[PDB]
Subunit: 209 residues, 4 copies
């Protein structure tokens, strides 16, 4: 009984792995099982009482032998892995009614992962006009092209009213346009490299075209 | 001392949040602090001994007052949040040497998230030739267009040697091409919809062009 | 009109950022807007026709001025950011009916991220019995303690019928138990370190207890 | 040659899947291949020139036949899948020197995923003192217990100087403690439920103990 509580507590915390089979347990049957095994430290008084005994597993509330629509996890059902379901099946049997087996599937996602940034990127900076003049600054990998350019303008004394564009300079007149403003220094492929800032001429033409 | 062990144990498990400041603690100084406070249940014998006393925080091993390159977390240093660092600073002071403060930054990522698939997608299926004949099947949201097409070919008796292509049929002769084979039924925008399968003519032309 | 198509196509692909306001557009109104602007290359024939003109934005299908329950993205509504909504509001106005504004929120998640493993971890291995005998092997950071132990047993000629346990050996008789079998070499804190394997005595006692 | 550019451009964008084999290409050899095939629209002038011809694949820069340590992706090497590597091997051969094959591995991670919150959670609220008085409010699933409690205090006119604690009330005197302050309403298991707020008595005891 206390073993039963410890078993299902750890089995509910099983890691989801693609292709694994999990089982839907009606939250009505499960709420009774909890009280009966003293699962919650704030609800131990009915532990072992034949009144809170859940009986054989009953998922009739969840079925129409097709499953009902709009069911929510935790509110209407509980998910247990094979081991967990077989243990509840051993201990209580199932109502005279088939099991509710569903598979773990993967969904691709774009997320945000945090990390402590120990090392900042040291980049070389110059203006197209006077490239002999090189300034070195350290930048966070999470900084966007937009943010890096504003900073380079502060360094090279460029008024916010003058239009600009940034380049990544290579050997022998090779210049990569950095025209994806929301990309991070990391996603733009800038490693520990020479940047070139360019001002739009008064007439509205560009010194590089 | 046992409070100290419990404090830093929970503070090492602090959640990373963008903009938060964390601190680098030399793993040499930290390994001594651990022994001295009996942090590990397998190493409690030197707890309180003036021999294992770590002294004021020393990060001289990590510094060159610039940080050394190629340092790895856990191997060379430990990360603690502000609270954790201020507590170690209170309890031990810092060597006569400035603190090593670094920021939490976010990095965009494509990942895989698991979920139990409770509901499968019911789709309508037909061949371009005879559209009067409609078959209904349930599919996993993780199935690719490639997998769905192979299954539809099995249903409509299409030999693997005959070339095909799949459509998503709308009202009044509107047909969407499903030519992204590795996309999931979910990413391809197929909800609870009529599919149309098309066979390439013997001559090498397509019945729809 | 073609500008309108290009604008909303890029604006639908806006990155979700916490605190941003997005707008619900009835998929009925949006399906008409699409046909009218020739959004899909397979449906351009009604482009500009006063028959497919969507009129002022109408979300009456989605409202009960409270929102209807069980609505699904793409099936019942489309999500556009502020810019996107203001552009549709500029171009078409809204029906005489308030906008449907909702916020971007973050949810914590355990996911799986892929990476090419360029460097494998070199670990030192020995048996408790004869520690003078040290073997060095390279392991993937994704290998579990369970997998590493089975391999160490193969190396030290240990039959699968004999029970075992693995240790992480430090200086001066300090031994860390590696009793979290599903943890990866990485999550268990094992870096480029001496492992100790231990066999359970015939009598059922342990050489280390 | 232009086919070659299009092939490797798409193959570099291959999705990482566990167990797949990828190949390390020295960024020196790859930078030359790029110029020669006119990979970058800002560097097409040397396209086809026997001067920028990369020759057979050479990874001697990356090898010591063991791989050099501290190598960074993009800076020192490029990663290509099997197809990509076999195509470069077909087109250029390999230097007389073995290939550098590495595997895709998964790492478990805690991340943050964004979603537009269409539906907020409607919760029932009351004070322990007078439970006959019930107030209903809608909350974001991302709100923490800490935030929800501060709001409930504003509703029930509780000064910030008076200490409190929150409960989740069930049927027949069952009260769950909500003592994980940083947990979200979602992670705390609160669905569309009765909350009970409790004030600490002047003497320092609790009305519920």
């Amino acid at each position: 009984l206390d073993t039963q509580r410890s078993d299902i507590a750890t089995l509910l915390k099983t890691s989801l792995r693609k292709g694994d089979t999990w089982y839907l347990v009606d939250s009505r049957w499960f709420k009774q099982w909890k009280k009966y095994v003293g699962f919650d430290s704030w609800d131990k008084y009915q532990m072992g009482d034949q009144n809170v005994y859940p009986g054989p597993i009953d998922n009739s509330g969840l079925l129409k032998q097709s499953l009902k629509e709009h069911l929510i996890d935790e509110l209407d059902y509980i998910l247990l892995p094979t081991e967990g379901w077989n243990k509840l099946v051993s201990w209580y049997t199932l109502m005279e009614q088939e099991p509710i087996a569903r598979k773990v599937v993967e969904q691709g996602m774009f997320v945000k992962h945090c990390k402590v940034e120990v090392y900042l990127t040291e980049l070389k900076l110059c203006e197209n006009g006077n490239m002999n003049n090189v300034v070195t600054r350290r930048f966070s990998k999470a900084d966007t092209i937009d943010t890096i350019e504003k900073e380079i303008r502060k360094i090279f004394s460029i008024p916010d009213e003058k239009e600009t564009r940034l380049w990544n300079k290579y050997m022998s007149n090779t210049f990569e346009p950095l025209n994806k403003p929301d990309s991070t220094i990391q996603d733009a492929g800038l490693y520990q490299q020479v940047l070139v800032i360019e001002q739009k001429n008064e007439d509205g033409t560009w010194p590089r075209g």
